[model samples]
Each structure stands twice: as structure tokens, then as C-alpha cells.
Target chain A: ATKVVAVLKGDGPVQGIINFEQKESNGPVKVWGSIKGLTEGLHGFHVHEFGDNTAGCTSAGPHFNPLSRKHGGPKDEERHVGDLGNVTADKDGVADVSIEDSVISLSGDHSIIGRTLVVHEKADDLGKGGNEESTKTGNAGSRLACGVIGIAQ
Target chain B: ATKVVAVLKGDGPVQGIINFEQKESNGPVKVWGSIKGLTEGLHGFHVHEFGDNTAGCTSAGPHFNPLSRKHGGPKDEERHVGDLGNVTADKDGVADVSIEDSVISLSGDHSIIGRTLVVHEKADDLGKGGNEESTKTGNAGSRLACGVIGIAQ
Candidate 1:
């Protein structure tokens, strides 16, 4: 049953949809999105710990690190499950991103459904800046936009 | 237990928030909304059969007539459970309406959650228009906008 997709609704100046696909070949889940109204630079992207957006993005909690490891880049083995790397927007404030991540799954205890996906105001250093906040939350700034990962038919 | 509300987003010309209040006794539930961007006339209002708006209001089906009865005025005993009658938009294209309905409930078999609240483009004749469509659909025109009824805290 690989029929699953998450529609991310944006608020304020941001608006777009993110797609997630689970494959049956034991391959990585295909993640992609075409977003608009982002700053002309890199933005920190992650699957947050909770799906509660009743109080906006802050209520979504920190990065979704089920393994309880420090934050690192997407290529690092000790990184959070949510460390999917950054999304760069063009001069027109648009971002077209495609990523294949093996760590992000849609089944079992690691299922991202009912969790939240957040976009930050600053770029994540990916734990390479040698700072405290760098490894904790990647030194990401305020949350710009977010949406819940729910089951879509 | 808190009350329930449905935010009716405009698919046509009107959009607003509608809230349902539960009563201590088996009294009528209060329904109210503050909507804007209407056509300065009366518009038909009712809860549709489904909450799925993947294709907009047309996908919400007909009025929520769970009892399989004929469509009549809101005050009629044989009317559909979603027979909310009409909401009159002022000259400024706004409709601030309040009504108390005995059949509409937030729980039980008649629970409005998982359903849809729809605002029509034209007025509902309330089955008094001397036509067959009047009794079936009250001559209500296209759907302007719609929203799902969900539990709101």
C-alpha cells in the first residue's frame, strides 16, 4: 500500500504543497515540493516532533529525532530523522526541491504522519558550525511556515 | 465538552466562521457566523452530505438529509436536518447570521462533524416556490463556498 501523500498548507506569505511517496522496493521515500514566497536564500527544513499547530509553529516542538541523537547534516548517521537538509529559493522567492531520504519513513514508530513540518527563517549550519545551538536546533531562526503531515488519499 | 464550529471558506463570494454551541438541556443549538463578500441578497445555507472538499463544494453532495425527508423551510418539521434556510447579505455584501436549530446537534447520529456547511449562490425558496426543485433543493443555486464541521476548542 504505497498510496500516501501529505498536503502542506501554508499561512501568511507562504503557500505550497509537499508530496511524500513510499516505495515498495525498500528504496528511500521520495520527498518533493514546489513552494512560493520564501526568502531568496537557504531555509532550514525539518519534520518537527509534534503535529499540534493550534498555537502555530512554536507548538510543533523541536526536530523529530526519534533516535535521540544530535542534529547533523542529512548525510551524517548521527543526525535527526528530520535532518533532510536545506531548500534554496531563487530570486523570485520560489523553491523547487526533490530529496530521497532513507531515514524518513511513513510506517511504524517512525511514521511522520500526525507530525509537523517546519520551515525556518535562517539556514541550518547542519552541526558543522561548532556551536551549541548549531547541534541542538541547527541554529535555525524563527519558524516561517509549517503544516501537519496527514494521510491523503 | 466544548462546542463545535465550522469555518466556511468562500468558493464563490462569501467566507466566514460558523460556530455551533451546545446547550445544557435538549434545547436548540445556536449557530452564528460573520461572513463577507456576498452579492447583497439572500443566500441559501445548509450542511451538505460530505466533508470532502477535494473538488470544492460540488463534491460535498446534497443537503444533509439523514432522515430521508423532503426539503422544506427551516421551521418545517419535515425539512432536512441541514435546512439552515437563508442568510441575507447586506448591501455591503456581508452576512452576520444567528439561528437556533432543534435538529442540528454536535453529537450522536446527527453529529454535524465529518459533514460540510455550504453557502449557496442563490436564495432557497424553502419549498414554497411552487416548483419541484423547490421541494428537492429549494431552488438554491451553485455553491459559493463550504467548510467541514469539526470539533473546535
Candidate 2:
């Protein structure tokens, strides 16, 4: 099995650790983690194209779409590989994330390692917001926190 | 200034944290950090093209030679941007790293935030080994540990 991890951090008090595990090459990746310091609502969660946070989260570039696909839900066949959809936070401002993704792999050219995982300020519309931005970003608001994915034992 | 960090890890007890800082856009980057669990000798260290570690550090890809330059020392003008030279570990198996380079940037087209930092098991020849592998990887042996660079507050 291959394992990867990202230690999330950002301005303010946002912090968390996201873990990714894959039992076989090119297999579905299991994502699990917990993020803190968010509002009591759904926030957009995704893998950005770059890990460059030189200008905070703005330098993370756009959603990871090496295939040049449009934004959509995780289950959509035409969605960007990064579009993992929204993560809901609790009343105490914490989000426990758990998801299994098939498009994102840990061993191939489409691997998500080295990219940036971003937490947004608003919920992702899943490309259903009826706007241009929705097709690009699922209408996810400003980035609030992010982390770089790395290999783990 | 822009600050970034990579939390290093490996199959064994090798662990460390590498920090990068750039005072201005496209300016010289200052690198510093301490890596533990190395032998009492010099170890080759460089940035790789990818952060994928699905097969340990081998999946990180070759040296980050976006400019397609030949391998050389950090001070060599025609070297890969990833070539940062060797880091020496003391008797206690700890390497106190500190370096400054002009080629690698934290922002702009040559930015390296999303790449991987690798620690090799042997000393880098700095392209002086007079062999094929020398010009490609500085003759650096196996990758011992690695981490992905990410943005930091």
C-alpha cells in the first residue's frame, strides 16, 4: 500500500492533517482527516494545481485539472480530478472529512501528491450554481486553509 | 517575504523539516533545516520534479530540470534548478543544513513550491564524477528520505 499525508495550516486558526491511502497502484484513494477553525457550514475542499502558497492560498493556482475537465461533483465523469466536493463543518467549527476517490491516484501520472489541498470559505456548488465560475471552481469561495501532499511510510 | 516548509519522512527513522524563505518575488531563496538519522558523511540533496512517493522516493521523478540544464553544483550557472549540492551529517547522524541559491524561486514561472525535496544515501559528485549518472543526478545514490514543499504562514 502507498500512504501520503498533508499537514494543513493557514492564516488565523485553521489546522488539520489529511491522510491518503491506496491499497494498489491506480486504485481508489481513501481520504480521511479533520480540519478545525471553520464556520458551521459546508466548505469547499479540493486539490489545487500547485502547492505554491507564496501569496498565501492564492498562489495555489486553480483546481487541479490536468485533463482539462470541467468542475463537477466527485461522482461526475467529466469533473476535474480535484473536485472532491464540499466538507461540512460542525457547530464548533470543525470538519471531519472522509471520502473515497477513484479519479485521483497515488502511483500514476495523475497522482495528487505535490499538489495543494485547499479549504474554502464557502460551500462548493458542485458545478450546479448556474454560473461560469461554477464550471471552473464549483463556486467555491476564497481559500481559507491549505496543505501540500507528501509521501509517507 | 514568502515562507514555505516541507515535513520530511521516510521508511525508517529519517525525519526533518526543511524551510524555504524568499524576501522578494523571483529573488534568491534561503534554505535552512536539520535532518536527522543520516550517517556521519555527506548526503546528496535536491528538489525533484514531482512529490509522488507511491514507490518510496523513486516516484518523485528526476531532478527538477525545467530549464533542461545539465547537472552541476548549486553555484554552477548551467545546473538543474533542483541541484542544491550536498549536506553533511555529523557524528550524531544529524545534518544542519543552511544554503542560499539564486536559481530556485518561491514565486513566478520557476517557482518550486509544489515539488519534492530528496535526501540521498550517498554524497553527490556535483557532476564531477565524469560519468553519465554524474551529469544526470550528480551520481547521488538511492533516495533515503523526501518531503513535499508547501506554503506556510
Candidate 3:
């Protein structure tokens, strides 16, 4: 099995621990973790392009797109591999869920070893808002928090 | 956070590794890798279309082209996602290189995870071979070796 971890950075109460694991060569990569300190609504969550948390989350870069496709949900065949969909926080400001991704891998040339995971302040419209920003970032608002991904034992 | 892909089963004497990292969602993907065991010449290297190793190197589909663009070199604005250029092996048959790619990502819709890396036996003409395969695989020769990208622990 192979796994990687991401630790977020920010000044807000927002925090998260993302665990990416793969048990098989061809099976979907499993993403299970928890995030807190969010509003009682949907928050945009994705693997940003950079692992540099310096200058906070903004420096983490854009969404990780290698094929130059449009923005969409993780489940969308045409979506971004980093687009793990909205991580919905409950009334207690916590979101705990698991995602199965066939696009993200821990091995190969497309690996995300030193990338970042970002939390947005608003919901990602999944590029369906018909707005230019929607297609770019789902208008997910400013960066709330981000973490650098690294190898875990 | 990181992802990985592997290359396996080369027809020649080449072994390769490709790495990916990003700084922003809208930024470029840093692609760098090392190839060993060549014949002291220029050989083609690229991100193949598929990840399936069932048929050996051939099963890893075509170039990772999602935008439906014509094949070109890595520097060309219009090219396949797998259009990385030639890897020149020295007398010791080793080629190490790093490339900043505007296309290809670790998080977005164009992610190349679960894909294959094909080290060609010949050179990729970069769509200037004046032939069909040149516009496609850059006229890169037979698949010398192939690897699968999987989650890394």
C-alpha cells in the first residue's frame, strides 16, 4: 500500500487532515479524512497545484490540471482530479467523509507528492454557474487554509 | 500531497522515472525524470495514453490528449499531454531532465494519474516527420519500456 498526507496552514479555525491511500494497482485511490472550523454549509476542497504554503494558501497555486480540461466535480468524468467535490461541514463545523478517486495516484509521472490541498470559503459551483470564474475556480472565494503534501510512513 | 507513476518493461535498455509538482492551480506542472540504459543516442519519452499493462507497453493507450489537439513537441503551445520530447542518453546511457509544463497536473481535470509512461525505441519527430505517426506519437519508435502510475505510500 502507498499513502500520502497533507497538513494545512492558515490563521482561521479551519483545519484538515487528508489521507490518500491506494491498496491496489488499478483500484480507486481512497481519500478519507476530516476537516473542521467551517461554516454550516458547503466548502470547496481541492488539491491545489503547489505544495508551498508560504504566503499562506494563495501561493499554493492553481488547481492541478494536467490535461487542460474544464472544472467539475470529482465524480465528473470531465472534472479535475483534485476536485474532490464540496466538503460539507455540519452544524458543528466539521466534515468527515471518504472519496474514491480513479484519477489521482500515488505512483507514476502524474503523482502529487509535493502538491497542496486547499479549502475555500464558499461552495464550488462545479463550473456550471455559466460564469467565467465558475469555469476557472467555481468562484470558491478566498483561500481559507491549505496544507503541503508529503510522504508518510 | 503526492502522486506517482511507474515505468516498466522496456524493449531497449532504458529505465525511467517521472515526477510531478505544482505551485498553483493555474500554474504549470513540473515534470522531471531520469532514464537509464540507452544506446548513447536520442530516444523518445512521453506520457502514453493508457495505464493498462495487459498488453505490455502497447496497452498504455495513446498520448494523453484530452483537448483533441495535434501532436507537437513539449515546447509547442499546441501538443499532446504526453508530447514530452527526446531523452538523449550519454555514453553511460543516462538522461535526466526537468520540464515545466503548462499542461498536465496532479489535481485537475487533465490529471495524468493512472496513465502510462512510454519510453520509445526511436525518436519522436514532434509532428514534423511528415507522416501520420509523427503527428501522433512524434514517430517515436516501439515501446521500449512502460510503467504504471499508482499511489505511493
Candidate 4:
């Protein structure tokens, strides 16, 4: 089992989280944990471009989609790689965030060793929410907050 | 005090995160620590439409942008509420993650609860990376990883 401690520094008043309480796989790493604390609504959360700390979360690029495709759902047969979808801040503005990866590597040029997260002021309608342009970000709004996703500090 | 948590149980093998320690204008809430993980490189991430649990990292909904808008930088004057800008991962696929909230509360309908995170398979080229779609999802592709944003267990 892989034992790892995750830490995140939020940029706004909302945020999400996960804890690797237990682990099992290594090659095809399989981790489990819980998430908490976030906006009281919806937010567009995903892996970014680079890890360089720039003006807030601007340093991070777009969704890390290696395969160029249209923006769709997480299960979209043809969508961007950075399209992990969206998170429900819930009515209480909180969520139990838990996840597993298959492509993101822990070591390599493709490794997000020092990546971060950016919270928009709006929600990503999944390229089909608000207007024609929404096809881009699902209409997810401004970068309300941001933070880095990595080992717990 | 309001409280909430989200868990991203199925996104991918590599996870990432960030945070904005919850503030208590209403009262002092027990804001806890957390873990946010990302992929190897930059990936456009965000909350989705549904929980997307059935589709691995496709259960979560689209960017929770209730307000219709375009996809761009977090600071974009016209963005969505679910627009969490972006986060980046390093060469080690490791990132720093955490949690905290302020205007976002929990325990009620108006809470930042029950959300999720989806890591893209590509990098959000920001404004110049891939095709037109890349403008929305940072040109990031695929559902590399995912984690349902939840409250602490």
C-alpha cells in the first residue's frame, strides 16, 4: 500500500480535500481518502498547466489533456484530458472528495509533482451549460480561489 | 458553525489539490486539514455536473457554474462560479493540497458540500496551447484522475 500525506493551500474562502488513510497498489497506484471544506455551491476544479507559482493560480495552465479533443464530461468518449468535470459545493458548501487516477504519474515530465488547483467564481456547465462559448468551460466562472495539490505539509 | 466535506474516491491514480482555510465570520468552526493531489503535468480541473461515480471519474457534474459565462483565466471579468482557475502538478506527479473556507459554510442547503474533483488528461494551455476548445479546459484532455470533493469523515 502507498502511504502519502496530502496538503493544499486554498486561495479563496472555499476548498476541497482528500486524505490517503489506506493504500494498496503502486505500479497502477490506487489510493483512497476523504475531502472536505469548500464553497457552498459548485466549482470547476482540475489539474493545471505548470507548478510555477505565478500571480496566484495563473501559473497553472489549462486542463492537462494530452489528447486534443472537445470539452466534454469525465466519461465523454471524446473530450479534453483535463476534463475531470466539476464538484458540487452542495447546499452546505461542503463535499467529501475522494478519487483515484490511472494516467497522472508521480514521477516523470508528465508528473504533477508541484501542481495546483484553481477555483473559479462560477461553475463549468460542461461545455453545454450557459451560452455558445460555454462549450469551452461549461461556463465555469472566474478564478475565485486556487491552491496546490500535493503531499500534506 | 457550518461544516462540510467531500471525497474524490475515483478520479485516477495521481491526485492533486489546494485550499483556502475556512474562515468563520459566523463563528469558529473546526476547519480541518486535508490532502489534494494532481497528475504528472498541468491539467484543467474543476467540479462537475453529476457525481459521475458510475463513470469512474465521470460521476461528478460539469463545472458548477450556475451563472452562464465563458471559460478563461480565473481573473477573467466574465467567468463562472465554478471556475476554479487551474492547478499544476510537477514532474513527480505530486502536489500540495489543503482545505479551508469562509463564505462557504456547511450543514445546510447553502453550503460548499458534496462536490467532486476531476483531473484532466492534458494541460490547460491557458490561451495558446491547442485548439479552440483548449481555451475552456486549458487544452487538457482525458479524465486522467478524479476525486469527489467531500467533507471530512
**RMSD (Å) of each candidate, 1 decimal:** 7.4, 9.8, 14.5, 22.6
Which CAPRI category fits model 1? incorrect
What does DockQ give for each predicted structure? Answer: 0.07, 0.17, 0.02, 0.02
Native contacts conserved, per model: 0.00, 0.28, 0.00, 0.00
lDDT of 2 by residue, A5-38 (tens): 7767788788787888999887889999899999
Could you tell me how far off, in angstroms, the CA of residue A128 lies in candidate 2 after the best superposition?
17
**Full ranking by lDDT:** 2, 1, 3, 4
Looking at model 2, residue B20 earns an lDDT score of 91
TM-score of each: 0.57, 0.58, 0.51, 0.41
- Candidate 4 to native Cα RMSD, angstroms: 22.6
In angstroms and one decimal each, the interface RMSD of every candidate reads 6.2, 6.4, 11.8, 12.3
Question: Which CAPRI category fits model 2?
Answer: incorrect
Error of 3 at B54 (Å): 39
Query: Which wins on TM-score, candidate 1 or candidate 2?
Result: 2
Candidate 3 structure quality by residue, lDDT tens digits, A18-137: 778888875678888888888999989888765543356776678878777778888788877678778888999998857788887766645565567788999999888977888788
Question: How well is each residue in B83-142 modelled by candidate 2, as lDDT tens digits?
Answer: 999999999999999999899886654666667899999999999886888999987798
* Ordering by TM-score: 2, 1, 3, 4
| Model 1, span A10-106: residue lDDT tens | 5568656677778654557888877778889998888887654445677678898888999988898889988877888999989887988888876
Residue B139 CA error for candidate 3 (Å)?
Answer: 55
